[PDB]
Design a binder for this molecule. Structure first.
Ligand SMILES: Cc1ncsc1-c1ccc(CNC(=O)[C@@H]2C[C@@H](O)CN2C(=O)[C@@H](NC(=O)C2(C#N)CC2)C(C)(C)C)cc1
Lengths: 87, 142, 104
């Protein structure tokens, strides 16, 4: 399986399937096997990776879909990352 | 353009809320105006009487966020075969991460204060531009 | 049934999935593919507990309803340098700032 590496502003290295990271058009352009995010800290980029897993699992599936959870403390920062990454 | 047909042929339906939201059913009447119906708590069901050709959509009763019904936007009751009712399965969509973040931020910040948030102007606009049935009726009519 | 995991060591975090019926040794082969270290140079953990190679992820408590796509379970990883194994160390993620006034 093909993986890529996404690196947070504080140096945390997240390793995810290439298919999943291509969820983001912005990440696709930054690749086309590692990307550095100078503005996104690890407590936000970890949640981004969890969204990829959730989207790929629950897109086109009739098994009841659960709510994607977002703690209030990280919501503003996650919003800005989502806008940048278009996802 | 988008409206129910005055068919007069009955059709029994089960509204099944398989979402964690409080659900507002909306019937589009013969002139295309949205008419709201009684709400359904999360996980609950109701047997209702409707008609063939009639149009329905479903929303979060509190925020108006959009919901799916049998995997799509609109539900049209069909012909009942062997007396059995039609099933309307109401579920959460897979929201984009951006729209899900906007929901959570809207739920924590009073609309007068959106402008105080330290974010780019276009996100302020995205926050104020909250879900609404008329807006979607235009889009779907397209 | 699929289980959804974060495998963590130091400042490294792998997102992947595996079968409930799959073994600990089999997860090390996955890690081997990604980080280029053989199973004999790996220890896997659940919290502080070392995991045995022949046991299933299910027996060790990774089940489809606790290791979810939107909230995956953590598996700790330690490497052997030279003769001996480093201790288990997982760097925590950053702290969120205080909520703005308008969100309180
Ligand atoms: C109890 C409940 N909980 C959530 S929704 C709900 C509920 C409550 C009451 C009803 C009663 N059924 C109706 O109002 C149906 C639904 C929709 O098809 C329109 N409708 C009608 O009966 C409509 N009637 C007709 O079209 C006709 C008649 N008569 C010409 C056939 C009218 C009276 C609103 C114009 C249906 C659902």
């Amino acid at each position: 399986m093909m993986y890529v590496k996404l690196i947070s502003s504080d140096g945390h290295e997240f390793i995810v399937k290439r298919e999943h990271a291509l969820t983001s058009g912005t990440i696709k352009a930054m690749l086309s096997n590692e990307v550095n995010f100078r503005e996104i800290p690890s407590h936000v980029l970890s949640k981004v990776c969890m969204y990829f897993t959730y989207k790929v699992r629950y897109t086109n599936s009739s098994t009841e879909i659960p709510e994607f959870p977002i703690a209030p403390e990280i919501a503003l920062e996650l919003l800005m990352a989502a806008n940048f990454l278009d996802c | 353009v988008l409206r129910s047909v005055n068919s007069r042929e009955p059709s029994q339906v089960i509204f099944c809320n398989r979402s964690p939201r409080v659900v507002l059913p909306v019937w589009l009447n013969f002139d295309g105006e949205p008419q709201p119906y009684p709400t359904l708590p999360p996980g609950t069901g109701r047997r209702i009487h409707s008609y063939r050709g009639h149009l329905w959509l479903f929303r979060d009763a509190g925020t108006h966020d959009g919901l799916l019904v049998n995997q799509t936007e609109l539900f049209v009751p069909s012909l009942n075969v062997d007396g059995q009712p039609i099933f309307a399965n109401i579920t959460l969509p897979v929201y984009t991460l951006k729209e899900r973040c906007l929901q959570v931020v809207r739920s924590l910040v009073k609309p007068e204060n959106y402008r105080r948030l330290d974010i780019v102007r276009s996100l302020y606009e995205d926050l104020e531009d909250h879900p609404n049935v008329q807006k979607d009726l235009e889009r779907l009519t397209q | 049934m699929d289980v959804f995991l974060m495998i963590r060591r130091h400042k490294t975090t792998i997102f992947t999935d595996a079968k409930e019926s799959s073994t600990v040794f089999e997860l090390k082969r996955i890690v081997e593919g990604i980080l280029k270290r053989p199973p004999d140079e790996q220890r896997l953990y659940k919290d502080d507990q070392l995991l045995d190679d022949g046991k299933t992820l299910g027996e060790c408590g990774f089940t489809s309803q606790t290791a979810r796509p939107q909230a995956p379970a953590t598996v700790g990883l330690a490497f052997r340098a030279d003769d001996t194994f480093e201790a288990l160390c997982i760097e925590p993620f950053s702290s969120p700032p205080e909520l703005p006034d308008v969100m309180k």
